[PDB]
Amino acid sequence: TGYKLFGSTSSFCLISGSSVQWSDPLPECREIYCPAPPQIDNGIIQGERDHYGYRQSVTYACNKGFTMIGEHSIYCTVNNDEGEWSGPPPECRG
Amino acid sequence: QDCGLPPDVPNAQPALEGRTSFPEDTVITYKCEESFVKIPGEKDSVICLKGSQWSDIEEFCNRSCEVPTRLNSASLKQPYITQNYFPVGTVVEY
Amino acid sequence: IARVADTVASGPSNSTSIPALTAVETGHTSQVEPSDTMQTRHVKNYHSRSESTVENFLSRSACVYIEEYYTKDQDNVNRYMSWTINARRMVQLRRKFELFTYMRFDMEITFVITSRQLPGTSIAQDMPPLTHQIMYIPPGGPVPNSVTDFAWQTSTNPSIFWTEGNAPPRMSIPFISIGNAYSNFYDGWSHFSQNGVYGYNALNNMGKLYARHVNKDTPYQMSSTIRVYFKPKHIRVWVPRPPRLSPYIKSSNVNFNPTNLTDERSSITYVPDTIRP
Amino acid sequence: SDRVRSLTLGNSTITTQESANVVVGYGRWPEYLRDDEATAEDQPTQPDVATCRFYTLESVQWEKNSAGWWWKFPEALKDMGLFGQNMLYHYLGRAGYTIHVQCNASKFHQGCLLVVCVPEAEMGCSQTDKEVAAMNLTKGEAAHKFEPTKTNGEHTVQSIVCNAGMGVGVGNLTIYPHQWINLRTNNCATIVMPYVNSVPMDNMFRHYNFTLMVIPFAPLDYAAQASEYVPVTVTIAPMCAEYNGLRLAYQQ
Amino acid sequence: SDRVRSLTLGNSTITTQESANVVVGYGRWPEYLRDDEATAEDQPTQPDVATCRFYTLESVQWEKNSAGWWWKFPEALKDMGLFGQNMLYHYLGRAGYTIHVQCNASKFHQGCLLVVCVPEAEMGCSQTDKEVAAMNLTKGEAAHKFEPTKTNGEHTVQSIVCNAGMGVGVGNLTIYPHQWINLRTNNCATIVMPYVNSVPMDNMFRHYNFTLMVIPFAPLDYAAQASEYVPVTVTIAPMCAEYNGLRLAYQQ
Numbered sequence: 001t002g003y004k005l006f007g008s009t010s011s012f013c014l015i016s017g018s019s020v021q022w023s024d025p026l027p028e029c030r031e032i033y034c035p036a037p038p039q040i041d042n043g044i045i046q047g048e049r050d051h052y053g054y055r056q057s058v059t060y061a062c063n064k065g066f067t068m069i070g071e072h073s074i075y076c077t078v079n080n081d082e083g084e085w086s087g088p089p090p091e092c093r094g
Numbered sequence: 095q096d097c098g099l100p101p102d103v104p105n106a107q108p109a110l111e112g113r114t115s116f117p118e119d120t121v122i123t124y125k126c127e128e129s130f131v132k133i134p135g136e137k138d139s140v141i142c143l144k145g146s147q148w149s150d151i152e153e154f155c156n157r158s159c160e161v162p163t164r165l166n167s168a169s170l171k172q173p174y175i176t177q178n179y180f181p182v183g184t185v186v187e188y
Numbered sequence: 189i190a191r192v193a194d195t196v197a198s199g200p201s202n203s204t205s206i207p208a209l210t211a212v213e214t215g216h217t218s219q220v221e222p223s224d225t226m227q228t229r230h231v232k233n234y235h236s237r238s239e240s241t242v243e244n245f246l247s248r249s250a251c252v253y254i255e256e257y258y259t260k261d262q263d264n265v266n267r268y269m270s271w272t273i274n275a276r277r278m279v280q281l282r283r284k285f286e287l288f289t290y291m292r293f294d295m296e297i298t299f300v301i302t303s304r305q306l307p308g309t310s311i312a313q314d315m316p317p318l319t320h321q322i323m324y325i326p327p328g329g330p331v332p333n334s335v336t337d338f339a340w341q342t343s344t345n346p347s348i349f350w351t352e353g354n355a356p357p358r359m360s361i362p363f364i365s366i367g368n369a370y371s372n373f374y375d376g377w378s379h380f381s382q383n384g385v386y387g388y389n390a391l392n393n394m395g396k397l398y399a400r401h402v403n404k405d406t407p408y409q410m411s412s413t414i415r416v417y418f419k420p421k422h423i424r425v426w427v428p429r430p431p432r433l434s435p436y437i438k439s440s441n442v443n444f445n446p447t448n449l450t451d452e453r454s455s456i457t458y459v460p461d462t463i464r465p
Numbered sequence: 466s467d468r469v470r471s472l473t474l475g476n477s478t479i480t481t482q483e484s485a486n487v488v489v490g491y492g493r494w495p496e497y498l499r500d501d502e503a504t505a506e507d508q509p510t511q512p513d514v515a516t517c518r519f520y521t522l523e524s525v526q527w528e529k530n531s532a533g534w535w536w537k538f539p540e541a542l543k544d545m546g547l548f549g550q551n552m553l554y555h556y557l558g559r560a561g562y563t564i565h566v567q568c569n570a571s572k573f574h575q576g577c578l579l580v581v582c583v584p585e586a587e588m589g590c591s592q593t594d595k596e597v598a599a600m601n602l603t604k605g606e607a608a609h610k611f612e613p614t615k616t617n618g619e620h621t622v623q624s625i626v627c628n629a630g631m632g633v634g635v636g637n638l639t640i641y642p643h644q645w646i647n648l649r650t651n652n653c654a655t656i657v658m659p660y661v662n663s664v665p666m667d668n669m670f671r672h673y674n675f676t677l678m679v680i681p682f683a684p685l686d687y688a689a690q691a692s693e694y695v696p697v698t699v700t701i702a703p704m705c706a707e708y709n710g711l712r713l714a715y716q717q
Numbered sequence: 718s719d720r721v722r723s724l725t726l727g728n729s730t731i732t733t734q735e736s737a738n739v740v741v742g743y744g745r746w747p748e749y750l751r752d753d754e755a756t757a758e759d760q761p762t763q764p765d766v767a768t769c770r771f772y773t774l775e776s777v778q779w780e781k782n783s784a785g786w787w788w789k790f791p792e793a794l795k796d797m798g799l800f801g802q803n804m805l806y807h808y809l810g811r812a813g814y815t816i817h818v819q820c821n822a823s824k825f826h827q828g829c830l831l832v833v834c835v836p837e838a839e840m841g842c843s844q845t846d847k848e849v850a851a852m853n854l855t856k857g858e859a860a861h862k863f864e865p866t867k868t869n870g871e872h873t874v875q876s877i878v879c880n881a882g883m884g885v886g887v888g889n890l891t892i893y894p895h896q897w898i899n900l901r902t903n904n905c906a907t908i909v910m911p912y913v914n915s916v917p918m919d920n921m922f923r924h925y926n927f928t929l930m931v932i933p934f935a936p937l938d939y940a941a942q943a944s945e946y947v948p949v950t951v952t953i954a955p956m957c958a959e960y961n962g963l964r965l966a967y968q969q
C-alpha cells in the first residue's frame with residue numbers, strides 16, 4: 001500500500017534457449033505521491049516537505065491574530081494507485 | 095535590456111504576478127514560504143539593473159512559529175501584539 | 189485460593205537496588221510492583237482471578253452455526269439441513285478459540301430449533317407438534333440425499349429426536365481429535381508436495397451434521413431454523429497468541445485486509461479535558 | 466559478566482560478547498520423545514551431532530527502510546547438510562532448534578529488531594479472494610520480507626508489517642518466545658525452541674512448525690561516513706532430532 | 718556496580734546509571750526532633766509522604782561561558798505542592814532534604830561542576846555601601862547565577878564567582894557537603910543534608926537554612942555538531958518534615 005506497480009503483473013518460467021528463464025523481468029513499485037499540499041490564507045504549513053507519501057501528514061498553523069478553523073493536519077491517502085489528501089485544509093479567520 | 099526570472103531564493107517565492115519579462119528598475123519582492131517569516135531588516139527584494147542583471151539577494155527567511163494562539167482568558171502584550179517573526183526560542187507574554 | 193498478590197508496605201529508599209531498571213532485550217517481562225518504585229501501605233488484597241480461568245472463559249454456550257429447512261417440497265427449498273461441523277463461521281466464538289494455538293476439551297452441544305409458517309392469503313391449518321431429527325455423521329458415514337433417505341435410520345450414528353415445546357435438546361461429546369489436541373492453526377498443507385489445502389481445513393474433520401422434520405408433510409409451507417451451540421468443558425489450552433485484529437473474511441483460511449493497529453486521535457499528547465467547572 | 470556467552474552443538478560453536486540472556490521456549494528445553502507419548506512403533510534414528518549443529522542461513526541487509534523478514538522451519542533447512550537428508554528419507558521428524566540471530570553495528574548506530582518464533586504462523590494472502598502458494602510462504606534459506614505497505618500479488622502473502630501477515634497486531638507478537646536486538650545494548654539474540662505441536666511428530670516438508678520473524682521497531686539510522694552496511698545473519702541448530710518412517714528420498 | 722542507584726521518597730523515584738556514591742551531610746542522616754531537644758510544646762504535624770517527596774525545579778542551561786548558579790532553601794520550595802502549603806500555615810518548620818543534581822552529556826563533551834550545600838550562606842552586596850534585597854538573594858525555584866566579573870547592582874549580590882558572593886575562596890567550598898559532576902565519569906550528584914541550625918526549628922520564609930551552589934571549575938566544551946544544549950536540573954526532597962505553630966496562611 002502506497003506504491004504503484006510499474007511493469008508486468010506476472011512472469012512465467014519458460015524454456016529459454018539452453019535453460020528455463022522467467023518470461024518477464026521484475027516490475028517496479030514506485031512511491032505514490034500526494035499532490036502538493038494546499039497553501040492557505042493567513043496560515044502556513046509547519047515543516048513543509050518536498051514530497052508526501054502514504055500516511056505522511058501536513059500540519060497547518062494560522063499566522064498571528066488569526067484563528068484556525070478545522071483540523072490542524074491532513075494526511076496523504078493512496079486509494080487507488082493515485083495519491084489524495086484526506087480532506088480539506090483548515091481555514092484561518094482573522 | 096529586460097531581466098528574466100528573478101534568482102532562486104531558498105524558502106522564498108518572488109511575486110511575479112504573473113509576468114515573464116521585467117523592464118529595468120523593476121523591483122521584485124520575495125515572499126517567505128509557509129513556516130517561514132522574513133528576518134527583520136534583511137533584503138527581501140531585488141531589482142532589474144543595467145545589463146539585464148538582477149540585484150543581489152540572499153536567504154532572509156528564518157523558521158518561525160505561527161502568530162501566537164488566540165486565547166479567551168488572555169491577550170498578547172506589546173510588542174508581541176504586532177509581531178510576526180517568532181524564531182525558535184521566542185517567548186511571548188500575555 | 190486463586191487470590192491476588194497483596195501489596196507489602198514500603199518506605200523510603202536510597203540504595204544500589206535497581207528494580208525499576210531492566211532490559212526488555214532479554215525477552216523478560218519486568219516483575220516490578222508499586223512497592224518497588226514508591227512508598228506503599230500494606231493491603232490485604234482479597235480479589236480473585238477465578239473468572240479469568242481458561243475454563244470459566246471458554247465454558248459458555250456460543251452459537252456456531254444456523255440454517256433453515258422447510259417442510260413442504262415446493263420450489264427449490266431445502267427440506268433438510270447439512271453442515272460440515274467447525275467453529276469458523278461465527279466470529280465471536282472463533283476469535284476466542286484463536287487466542288490459543290492448541291485446545292483439548294470435552295463439549296456440551298445444545299440445539300435451539302424454532303419453526304414458523306410462511307406468509308399467505310389462505311393458510312388456516314392445525315398441524316400437530318413438529319418433531320425434528322438431528323443426526324451426526326462422522327467422516328465416511330453415508331450421507332442422506334433426501335428427507336426420506338435410508339441414512340436417517342440412525343443404525344449406529346448418534347441422533348436426537350426432539351419435539352417443539354420441550355427444552356432445547358442437548359448432549360455431551362468427548363475429545364474427538366485424532367491428535368493429542370485440537371488445532372486452531374495449521375501452517376502446513378494436506379499434501380506432501382506442499383499444495384492442496386492450507387491451514388485448518390487441511391487436517392480438521394469433525395464430520396457432518398444433518399437435520400430434518402420427521403413429520404411427513406405440512407398443508408402449507410413452513411420452515412424451521414436450527415442454531416447449534418458449543419460449550420467446551422474440561423478445557424486445556426496451549427501456546428497463546430495475538431488476538432484477531434483484522435475482520436474475518438473466509439471461514440476456510442486466515443485471509444484479511446490491512447487493518448489499523450487501533451483508533452486514531454489528535455496527537456500523542458492529546459488528552460480530553462473532562463474538568464470544566 | 467553475563468554479557469558474554471558461548472554455544473556448542475556438534476562441531477559448531479558460537480561466540481558472543483554482547484548478548485542478553487537466553488530465552489528458553491515456553492520454559493521448556495528440547496527433549497527426545499518419551500515412550501509414554503510415542504506413536505510410531507519403529508525405532509527412531511538419532512543422528513545427534515550429525516544433524517544437531519549450527520546451520521547459518523543467507524545473511525540479510527538491514528536498511529533504513531527495511532520492514533522485516535521471516536523464515537519457516539524446518540522447511541528452510543531442507544538443503545542443510547544431513548539434517549536435510551533425514552527430512553527427505555523420513556516420513557516423520559521431531560527437533561528442538563536453537564535460534565541465534567546476529568547483528569552488530571556500533572555505539573553510533575541505532576535501531577531495534579524483534580526476533581520472534583511464531584508456532585503455526587498460518588499466514589494470509591494478498592488477495593483475500595484467492596489462496597497462497599508454498600513458494601510464497603517459504604523459499605529455502607532465502608528469506609521473505611515484510612513490506613511497509615500493502616501487497617497485491619495473486620498468491621502472495623500480505624507482507625504489510627503492521628499485521629505481520631496474520632491479521633494481528635505486531636506489538637502483540639511479544640507473546641511468543643522472543644528477544645530484541647537493541648543495537649545500543651545488544652549484538653544478537655538467542656532462543657531455544659522446544660518441539661511445539663499437537664502431535665508427537667510430523668512431516669517436515671508438509672508442515673511448517675514455526676516461523677522466525679525479525680521485525681524492526683526502531684528504524685536503522687546513523688550519520689555520514691558511518692558504515693551503511695548492517696547485515697543480519699540467522700543461525701539455527703536442531704536439538705534432539707528424531708526420525709521415523711524411513712523410505713525412498715522425497716523428490717523436491 | 719555502585720554506579721547505578723535508585724532513590725525513593727513518597728510517590729517519587731529517581732534513577733541513575735552513572736552516580737558517584739552519596740554524600741550524607743556531616744555524617745548525619747535526617748531525623749525527627751527528639752523530646753529532649755524540643756521546645757515547641759504543641760504536637761507537631763508530619764505530612765510524611767505528602768511533603769517528603771522529590772520536587773524538581775526549573776532546569777538551567779550550562780554554557781561555555783556559564784559562571785554558576787545558586788538556590789536558597791527552604792524558600793525555593795515555597796510553591797511546591799503541600800511542602801509549600803505547610804510553610805504558609807506554620808510558624809515553625811524542620812526538614813532534611815535530599816539534593817539530587819542531574820546533568821548528562823556524552824563521552825565527547827567535557828566539564829566539571831561543583832554541587833555544594835552551604836549552611837547559613839550569608840551573602841554580600843554588589844555595592845559594599847548598601848544592603849541586599851531578599852528578591853536578589855532568592856527568587857522561588859528561579860535560580861540566581863554567578864557572573865565571571867564584578868557586579869554593580871544597587872541591592873544586588875556580588876555575583877563574582879571567585880568569591881562565591883561570600884568574600885571567600887571558591888576552591889575552599891569543598892569544606893561543605895558536596896560532590897562534583899565530572900561529565901567524563903559522572904551524570905549527577907546526590908547530597909543528603911541533615912537539619913543544620915543553632916535552633917531545634919525555625920521559620921522557613923524568614924530564614925534560608927542553606928544555599929545550593931553549582932559552580933563549574935571545568936568549562937563546558939565540545940566539538941562541532943555536538944549537542945550544544947546541556948541542561949542542569951535540580952531535584953530536592955524534604956526529609957522528616959515537622960511543623961509547629963498552625964495559624965492563618967502567610968500572604969507572600
Ligand SMILES: CCCCCCCCCCCC(=O)O
Nearest residue numbers: 273275324361370371372394
Ligand atoms: C455429535 C456432534 C459432534 C460435533 C463435533 C464437534 C467438534 C468440535 C471440534 C472443534 C475443533 C476446533 O475448534 O479447533
